[PDB]
Design a protein around this nucleic acid. Structure first.
Lengths: 125, 148, 258, 193
RNA sequence: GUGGCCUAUCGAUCCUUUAGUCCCUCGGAAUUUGAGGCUAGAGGUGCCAGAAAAGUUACCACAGGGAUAACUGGCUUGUGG
RNA sequence: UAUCUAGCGAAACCACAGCCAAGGGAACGGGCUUGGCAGAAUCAGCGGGGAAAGAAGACCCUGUUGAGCUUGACUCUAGUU
RNA sequence: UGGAGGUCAGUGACGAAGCCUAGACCGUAAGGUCGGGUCGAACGGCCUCUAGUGCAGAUCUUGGUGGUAGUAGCAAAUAUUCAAAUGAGAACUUUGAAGACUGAAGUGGGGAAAGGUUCCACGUCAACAGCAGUUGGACGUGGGUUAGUCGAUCCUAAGAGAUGGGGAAGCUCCGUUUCAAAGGCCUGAUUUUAUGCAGGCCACCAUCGAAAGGGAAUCCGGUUAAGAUUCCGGAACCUGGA
RNA sequence: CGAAUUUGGGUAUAGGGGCGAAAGACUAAUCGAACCAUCUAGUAGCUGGUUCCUGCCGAAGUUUCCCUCAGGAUAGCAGAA
RNA sequence: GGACCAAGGAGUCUAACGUCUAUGCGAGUGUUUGGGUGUAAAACCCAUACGCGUAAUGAAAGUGAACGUAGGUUGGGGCCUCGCAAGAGGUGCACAAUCGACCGAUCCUGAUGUCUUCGGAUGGAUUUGAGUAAGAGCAUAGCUGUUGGGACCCGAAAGAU
RNA sequence: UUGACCUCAAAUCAGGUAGGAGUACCCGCUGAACUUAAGCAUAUCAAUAAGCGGAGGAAAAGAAACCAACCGGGAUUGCCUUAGUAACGGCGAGUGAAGCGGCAAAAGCUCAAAUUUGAAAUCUGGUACCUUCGGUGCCCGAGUUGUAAUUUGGAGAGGGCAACUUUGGGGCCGUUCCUUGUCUAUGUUCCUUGGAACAGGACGUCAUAGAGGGUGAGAAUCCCGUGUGGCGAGGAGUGCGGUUCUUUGUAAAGUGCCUUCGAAGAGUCGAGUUGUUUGGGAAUGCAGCUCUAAGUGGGUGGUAAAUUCCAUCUAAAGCUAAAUAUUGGCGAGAGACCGAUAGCGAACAAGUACAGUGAUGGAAAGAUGAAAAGAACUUUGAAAAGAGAGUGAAAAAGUACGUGAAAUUGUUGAAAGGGAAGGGCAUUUGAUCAGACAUGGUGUUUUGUAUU
C-alpha cells in the first residue's frame, strides 16, 4: 500500500539494491532485534549489529545458543559469533555465519556514538 | 483474438489454405492498382466504370466554406422549434403569434419543400429557399423572410 | 527495432552445399559462417516483430459502458449471483446490504474490521486472506507474485476516513457512488460483486442512475428497458390465459412403437 | 492487385512511414503534466486568474459568421471606449489586440460592456498598499462567458407582402450576373450619338 | 430509302483539332482578348481491348524448367535393312 | 607401399537398405507381381551395378532477371565548338 | 501451449514442476487421468481474456551424436645400432662406443624483414609435440639485453607535405616559392644595468622522407647459465668546451 | 642464364579507377569492374517449406480480355451465411 | 529433400475498407483532441465543435424531391368476418414484376411582365441519375476477404552512397 | 624638418576567443539507387538513406508586405478536423497541402531612417580604492565617416491650451525550489513435519503500515523498509509576507483638446530565362544569369493579358518564454513483454576472446550446497586415481557439481534372426495386468449385550 512515487515496489530493483548496497547500507540491513530485557531497559526495538554485542541465536539449528559477536561480514551479509562454529573432519573449527535477523541481542557494546544512537531512537539509557 | 483465426485451423495442413498448384506467391498480379488498363481492365470495367480519364472543369483553391449550405425540408422544419413549445404552437395556430424559425441558427442554408407541413402559419427565416418550399409555407399561411 | 539485424550477413548463394540463408562473414570467431536474418535462425529477427503501434486500448460506447454498469449494480442485489461469484454472504442478513453513515465517518482500521464483523462480511475478507496464494507462472518475476480473491466493495458518498480505514484490509475495495467502476462491480466479467452500500450511497444512487420520476443527471441518459416485461416465462407459459388456448399435450416421452 | 467488387482505397504507405509513427501513449501523462503546470503557474501568480480577458468576435467565413466566439484581444478603440490605455490594460489583465479593427457597432458595444464589467468585478492590489487577499478565481473565460446574442423573439406577427422570397433571390442573382453587360450596353448606347 | 443485295472492309484513356451551344467557369467586382468545360466528329495505336525501343556475348551471371532441345531407353517403322 | 601387429586415428557419403530373371510401372526395380531361390561371422582384391560421390546443368529454353561489350537503337551527358 | 481477469477460502517440502516407465483407465482422435521410480519449490481444474500458441521435412537454424571405423591412413628429404645412467615406465632422454649424412651457392658461423622472450637455469608431464616421451620452441617459477666510438639520431633521393595564396556548400583540393613586408649571422659598445646599442655583412624561402645510399670517432685479450666492438684489463681515437 | 637480366627496401598510381611487351590479364587464394559497411528484411509472375484432431460439404484445368502463353482479372465450378 | 536427435522455426500487426454477425442508441450517432476528477496511464463525468447519416443531380452556373389515402395493377405472410362440417370475402407489412407521379441533367415549347433581352410560367420528349415516393444510420467488437506496408517464411544475377 | 591623418603590418606585447566530442530530437546544404509502375525513360521510392556544416535544453517559427471576401479574423507552434479533399500525375502507378472551426499554450516587441548642438550627454581598457557576476575616481583610448537620451507605424515628433495620476536601490528574516539526514507500530508465544518454519494447527497484536525485498521453504507482526506525521543540514532566492536605512527629483512615465509634420530598409521589389522543387496547375518556393524600379508607392487577392476599381497587409533589418520534438546524457516509476538457442551482440574479466594489412567482422559462456561443512584418516597404485571412511537433509549434489531428456553407447536380462527390418487383420504361445465380494440384511445357532 505504498503511497509515494519515489518508492518502488519492483522486485528486480529491490533485489539489485540489496545485493549491491555498500557497507554503510549493509549495517542498517544487518540490524538485529533486542531481547525482551533489553527492550524493557532501553525502549528501543531493533538496532544495527556491532562487534562486541552479546547475541542469542534464536532460530535455526543452533536454537537458543549464546555468544559474543566475532565479526560482522557485511560482504557475506552475515555475523560470525564466538563459540558457534563447525568442527571439520580434519579437526579445525571454522566460523559458522548467521543472519542477525535470526538473532537476539542480549548485551550491547556501548560508547558515545551508540548511546547517542539509543537516545536518538528514543532510548532512555 | 488469434485463437479464433483460420491459421490456427490450418496448423497441420501443408499449404495453409493457399493451394498446391498456384501457391501463395508475392505479387502475381502487380502491386496496388497495377495493370488497370491491361490485365485488370475486366475488373475495372465491370466494377468501377468511369475510372480512367477526366471530365469537368478544374477549380484552383476551392474552399468548402463557400459551398457550406445544408438543406432543410419542410417535414423536418417543425423539429427546429423546441419540443415543449411545439404542441403549444400547433394548438395556437394563428397569425400575429406565429413562431419564427431561424434555420440559419439551426445550421441550415437552404429550405427545400419535401412537403406536407400543417396549415398553421409560421415564420421561416432562411437565407435560401426553394420555389416549392416558399409556395408551401405561403399556402400554410406563414411567410419566409430572407436573412444573411 | 534493430534486434536480429545488427549483422552484415550475406547469402553464400548456391553451389556450396549449404542452404541459401544469409550467413555472417569474416573468420576465426565461431560466429563466422553462421545463419542470420531469419526467424528460423538462432540470433535472427523474430517473425513479424511485435510493434509498439498495436492497438492496446479499445473504445466502448459510453451508453454501452453505462448499460453494463447498471447490470452489475442490479446483479449486486441478486442473492444467487453473489453466491455464484463466491462471496460468502450466507450469514449476511439480506442483500443489497446497507449501513449507516457512521461507517462513512469511520477512521481506524480496527473500527473498519469491527464494522465488517458486525455486518457479516468478515467471512468474505478472511476468505480473501486465506485465498492469498503464489502465482503459477512467469508473472511472479513481473511484479505479480501473489493472487487472492476479491472481497466486499464498500460504496460511500462522502470520504471521511473510509479509504484510509479500509485501505489495509485485504480484499476489501472502496468506491463512491459517483464513479462505480464496472471493473470492480463485475470483476472477471462475473456479475454479482458483494457490495456494502452506505445509506447516503443508496440515496445518491437513486439520483445518479435515474428512476421513473427523477432524471439520471447523466446528460441525455436513461436506464435501459428490457425486451421482456418479466423474468418468469414459466409463469407466463403456465398462466390461464396461455393455457386455455392451447391444444392438449402429448406425453413428454413418445412410446417406442414398432 | 485489383480484385473483387471493392472500393478503390488510397493508402499512402509506400514511404518509410514506420519510422515516422507517433503513438500517443503519453496522452494521460501529458494531461497530468498539463494540469500540474496549470496548478503550479496558478500558485506562482496566486491572486491572478491564470488567463487573460478575451473579446467577443464574429467568426469570419459564411459557414461560421452565424456564431460568436472568443477573440485574440480587445481593440485600441475598445480599450479607449472602456476608458483605459492599452499598456495599463495589458498590465492589469486584458488582452489587447492592436491589428483588429471594429467596423461593427454591436460588437463594439458588447466588447466595451465586457471591459466595463471586468473592471467592475476585478480588484487591483495597489503597488504599496496592504494587500487585501482576495480568493483567486482561476478562469476569466468561465467568469465572463461568451454568450451568443439573441436576434429576435420566439413568436412575432406574420407580415406577408407578396414576393415569395424566391423570385427576389433569383432576380438578385440575375442582376449580379448581368450588371456588367448592362453597364457596357449603356456605355455603347450613350457613346453612339 | 438511316449508304453499297447479305455475310469482311477496322480503333480506347491522355493530348491536339474542328463543329455546335455563343451555353457554363477563370472563385474580391467587371469589360475585352486568352484559357478551361459541356455534346459530336477527326489526327492511332495492324502486337489491331491500343508500351515510345537496336545488337552481341565462344568472358559471362541468376531464378527456374525434363512444361523444352542436344544421349540412352520407350511407342511407330515412313526411310534404311 | 599395400598386407599383419603395437600405438594413434580421420573423411566423403548415408530415406530405409542391399541376390537375381521376366512382367507391369514415370516406357531401364533393391523393394511391387510371378518365378529362381535362400544359412552365422568374415579377410584380401575388384571395379559390373548402386541410372555411386563431388556442384540448385555452365549446353538449351523460359523469365516482361542481369551484367561485359558494340552500334546509324531509344533517351541523355562530361568535354568541345 | 505461454501469459491475463475471476473462481475453486484448489494441489503442494508429509513432496509442486520436470523427467523415465512393452503398468492401469478414459476419449474415434487431438489428448486427459492415475500407479511405480527420480526430483526439490512451485503448480493446476472451471468461466472468460490474450498470443511471439502445436513441426518430420524447408541442401531449415544452433548444438549434440552416429554408421562408415579401429577403417583410410601416420610410406618424399639414404639410417640406424650396442651398452650404461636416469626413471614406475625408454625405439625416441643423457653419456660413451660404433655406422652415417649435410660436404664450405652446408643440415656450418652470422645477420635484414618478421616474431616477441621462443634466449638461459631450475622444477615438472595433465593438455600439446597426428607413436612415445623421464625430452621440448610445451607447463610453472625466475634470471638475462650495459656503448662517446655499432645503429638510430644528422643529410638529402624518388617523393610526402604545412605556410602565403587561390578553389570548393563543405569534408577538404591545389600549390612548395609561388603575384608574401617571409629571418638568422658575427666582433665589440654603456660596461653605477639590460647584450634596447652613434656596428656591420647579409637574404639562400618550412618540414618529413634511407637501421642497404651519404656519414666524426675502438681495437685486442678475458669474462656469463644466458650480454658484450657495449662489461673487465690494456691500449687508442673523435666531437664539443675550457 | 651478362642482360629488354634477377632482386631487397623506399616511393607513385585506387575501383568504371589504376596498371597492362595486351591474356580481359593483374589490382592481398577476390576481377568481363576489388574489398568493407549501409541503403536492404532490395524485387522475384520462379524453386523449397508452411506445425493439432474429428465432423459436414466439396472442385478446376473451361469462357472472354491482358507484351497474354510457368502469371493475372473475369464468368463458371465450391463453401458459408 | 531427408544419416540421426533435442531446442528454435513460417499468413503477423497496422492504416483505410467490402460482406456478414453481436451489442448500444436511433434521425440521429460517436465521452476518451481537450476539460473535470481520481484510490492516478485505470475508472467516473462534461461540452461546443468535428466526422458519418438525414438530398439528389449537374462539368458548372445552378436547381432541388406528394393530382392521388405517398398512386394504379399482379402476387403476397399475417390478421379480420363467415361455415360444428364447403370454402369465400375484406385488409394486406416486407418483398418481387409492371404502369405511373415527383426532383436533377439533356433536348424542345416559350405566359403575364419586361433596368427590351432579362425572366421562365405552362406544356412536352423511343433521353439520362449512384435520386423521392412515412427515413436507417452511427459507433464498438468478431470471423472472412482487399489494398499499401519487410507482409506467410528463406532465396538472386544486380543497382546506389 | 613641431607632429598628425589614412591604409597596411610586426611583436612569446595586455586580455580574450574559435577549433574537437556527443549528435536521439533541431537548423541548413548536398543527395542516390534498390523499389513501384506487373517491362521502362517522366513519375515513384524521396525533397529519403549515405556525405557535409551548425545549435540547444529544446531548436526552429514568431508578432503579418498574414488569412480572408465574412456581420470579417488577428504573432508563432502543436493536437482533433479540414482530407485522402482542392490540386498535381506516361491524369497511369501514384501523390497531395491550406483557410475557416474546436482545443493546448498564449506575450510581446526594437533598430535604421530626426540637430544634444546651450556643450559625446556614450563606451573598452590601464591605474587606485571598495562592500568584487560588480561600484566609484583619474588617465590614455574608441568615437562626430556618430557612441548616449527620444521615436518604430499599434504609431510617433514639434509647438500651444489644460486639471491631474503613478514611481527608488541594495541587504535580512521567512515563504518557495534543488539536494540531503534523522526519528516515527504490531508474536518470532505453544503443538506437528522438516536440515532449516518463512509450512500446517491454536491463541493473539498493529494497521493512515496486508507495497517490495532479505532471512536455511509461501513471513503485515524477525530485519530493512512500507504508511502517517515530526525534527535537522547545504545552496539558489525578488514568485511574494514582513523589515533595514536610503528623498530624492521644480527627476521619470501615462492620459484630454488643437495646429504643423509624420523620415519607414535597392543590384531590392519586380520582369525575363535557366535548373530544381511544390498539391501550386501560362510557372509554389529556392538558386544562377540578364534587365532592373517607385512613393496615395509596393506586395498579395491560386488562369496568362490590357483597362477600371475594391479589400487587406507594409518586404528587401532585429529580439522573444509556453504549448511542441527527443531510439543520445543523467535521475526515476512501471509492463497481460522475454526468460540464458529467448531478451540488446553482450544476464558472465562483451564490443571481450578471436579473424582480417585495412575498413571492419565478432562469439561461446548463468544455477553445488542453507552453510565448503570442498571429503580428515586407512589401504592399493609411481602417479592420476580407486576401494573404504567422512561432511551433508541429499554425494541419485564432489567443482568434469540444481534436475539431467533424446540421438548415440556399455553391461545385464528376455526374445527373434536361411539375401533387410518395420506394419494391418486374426488366433496361439510366453510374460505381465485391471476389473464383481464380504455391501441394507427379512436368517438372528451371538463378542467389547444396537458394537457383526
Amino acid at each position: 500500500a505504498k503511497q509515494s512515487l519515489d518508492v518502488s515496489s519492483d522486485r528486480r530493483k529491490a533485489r539489485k539494491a540489496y545485493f549491491t548496497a555498500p557497507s554503510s547500507q549493509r549495517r542498517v540491513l544487518l540490524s538485529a532485534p533486542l531481547s525482551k530485557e533489553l527492550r524493557a531497559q532501553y525502549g528501543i526495538k531493533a538496532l544495527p549489529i556491532r562487534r562486541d554485542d552479546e547475541v542469542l541465536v534464536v532460530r535455526g539449528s543452533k536454537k537458543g545458543q549464546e555468544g559474543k559477536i566475532s565479526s560482522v561480514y557485511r560482504l557475506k551479509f552475515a555475523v560470525q559469533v564466538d563459540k558457534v562454529t563447525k568442527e571439520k573432519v580434519n579437526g579445525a573449527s571454522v566460523p559458522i555465519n548467521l543472519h542477525p535477523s535470526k538473532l537476539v541481542i542480549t548485551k550491547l557494546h556501548l560508547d558515545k556514538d551508540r548511546k547517542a544512537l539509543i537516545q536518538r531512537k528514543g532510548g532512555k539509557l | 483474438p488469434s485463437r479464433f483465426t483460420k491459421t490456427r485451423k490450418h496448423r497441420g495442413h501443408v499449404s495453409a489454405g493457399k493451394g498446391r498448384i498456384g501457391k501463395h506467391r508475392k505479387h502475381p498480379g502487380g502491386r496496388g492498382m497495377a495493370g488497370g488498363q491491361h490485365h485488370h481492365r475486366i475488373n475495372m470495367d465491370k466494377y468501377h466504370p468511369g475510372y480512367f480519364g477526366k471530365v469537368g472543369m478544374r477549380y484552383f483553391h476551392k474552399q468548402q466554406a463557400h459551398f457550406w449550405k445544408p438543406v432543410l425540408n419542410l417535414d423536418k422544419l417543425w423539429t427546429l422549434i423546441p419540443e415543449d413549445k411545439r404542441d403549444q404552437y400547433l394548438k395556437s395556430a394563428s397569425k400575429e403569434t406565429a413562431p419564427v424559425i431561424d434555420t440559419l441558427a439551426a445550421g441550415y442554408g437552404k429550405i427545400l419543400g419535401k412537403g406536407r407541413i400543417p396549415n398553421v402559419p409560421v415564420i421561416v427565416k432562411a437565407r435560401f429557399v426553394s420555389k416549392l418550399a416558399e409556395e408551401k409555407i405561403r399556402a400554410a399561411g406563414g411567410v419566409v423572410e430572407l436573412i444573411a | 527495432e534493430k534486434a536480429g539485424h545488427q549483422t552484415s550477413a550475406e547469402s553464400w548463394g548456391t553451389g556450396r552445399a549449404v542452404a541459401r540463408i544469409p550467413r555472417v562473414g569474416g573468420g576465426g570467431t565461431g560466429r563466422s559462417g553462421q545463419g542470420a536474418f531469419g526467424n528460423m535462425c538462432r540470433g535472427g529477427r523474430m517473425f513479424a516483430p511485435t510493434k509498439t503501434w498495436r492497438k492496446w486500448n479499445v473504445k466502448v460506447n459510453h451508453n454501452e459502458k453505462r448499460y453494463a454498469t447498471a447490470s452489475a449494480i442490479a446483479a449486486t442485489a441478486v442473492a444467487s449471483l453473489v453466491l455464484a461469484r463466491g462471496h460468502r454472504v450466507e450469514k449476511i442478513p439480506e442483500i443489497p446490504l446497507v449501513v449507516s453513515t457512521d461507517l462513512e465517518s469511520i477512521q481506524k482500521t480496527k473500527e473498519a474490521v469491527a464494522a465488517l464483523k458486525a455486518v457479516g462480511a468478515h467471512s468474505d475478507l478472511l476468505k480473501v486472506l486465506k485465498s492469498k496464494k503464489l502465482r503459477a507462472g512467469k508473472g511472479k518475476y513481473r511484479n505479480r507474485r501473489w493472487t487472492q480473491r476479491r472481497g466486499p466493495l464498500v460504496v460511500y458518498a462522502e470520504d471521511n476516513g473510509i479509504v484510509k480505514a479500509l485501505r489495509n484490509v485485504p480484499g476489501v475495495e472502496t468506491a463512491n457512488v459517483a464513479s462505480l467502476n464496472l471493473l470492480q462491480l463485475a470483476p472477471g466479467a462475473h456479475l454479482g460483486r458483494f457490495v456494502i452500500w452506505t445509506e447516503a450511497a443508496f440515496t445518491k444512487l437513486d439520483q445518479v442512475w435515474g428512476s421513473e420520476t427523477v432524471a439520471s443527471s447523466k446528460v441525455g441518459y436513461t436506464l435501459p428497458s428490457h425486451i421482456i416485461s418479466t423474468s418468469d416465462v414459466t409463469r407466463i407459459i403456465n398462466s390461464s390465459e396461455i393455457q386455455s388456448a392451447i391444444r392438449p399435450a402429448g406425453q413428454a416421452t413418445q412410446k417406442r412403437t414398432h | 492487385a485489383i480484385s473483387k467488387n471493392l472500393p478503390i482505397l488510397k493508402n499512402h504507405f509506400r514511404k518509410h512511414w514506420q519510422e515516422r509513427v507517433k503513438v500517443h501513449f503519453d496522452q494521460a501523462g501529458k494531461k497530468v503534466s498539463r494540469r500540474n503546470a496549470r496548478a503550479t503557474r496558478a500558485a506562482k501568480i496566486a491572486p491572478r486568474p491564470l488567463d487573460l480577458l478575451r473579446p467577443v468576435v464574429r467568426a469570419p467565413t459564411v459557414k461560421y459568421n452565424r456564431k460568436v466566439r472568443a477573440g485574440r484581444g480587445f481593440t485600441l478603440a475598445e480599450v479607449k471606449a472602456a476608458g483605459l490605455t492599452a499598456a495599463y490594460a495589458r498590465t492589469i489583465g486584458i488582452a489587447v489586440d492592436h491589428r483588429r479593427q471594429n467596423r461593427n457597432q454591436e460588437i463594439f458595444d458588447a466588447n466595451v460592456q465586457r471591459l466595463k464589467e471586468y473592471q467592475s468585478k476585478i480588484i487591483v492590489f495597489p503597488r504599496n498598499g496592504k494587500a487585501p487577499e482576495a480568493e483567486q478565481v482561476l478562469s476569466a473565460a468561465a467568469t465572463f462567458p461568451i454568450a451568443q446574442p439573441a436576434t429576435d423573439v420566439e413568436a412575432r406577427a406574420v407580415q406577408d407582402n407578396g414576393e415569395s422570397a424566391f423570385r427576389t433571390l433569383r432576380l438578385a442573382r440575375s442582376e449580379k450576373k448581368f450588371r456588367g453587360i448592362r453597364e457596357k450596353r449603356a456605355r455603347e448606347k450613350a457613346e453612339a450619338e
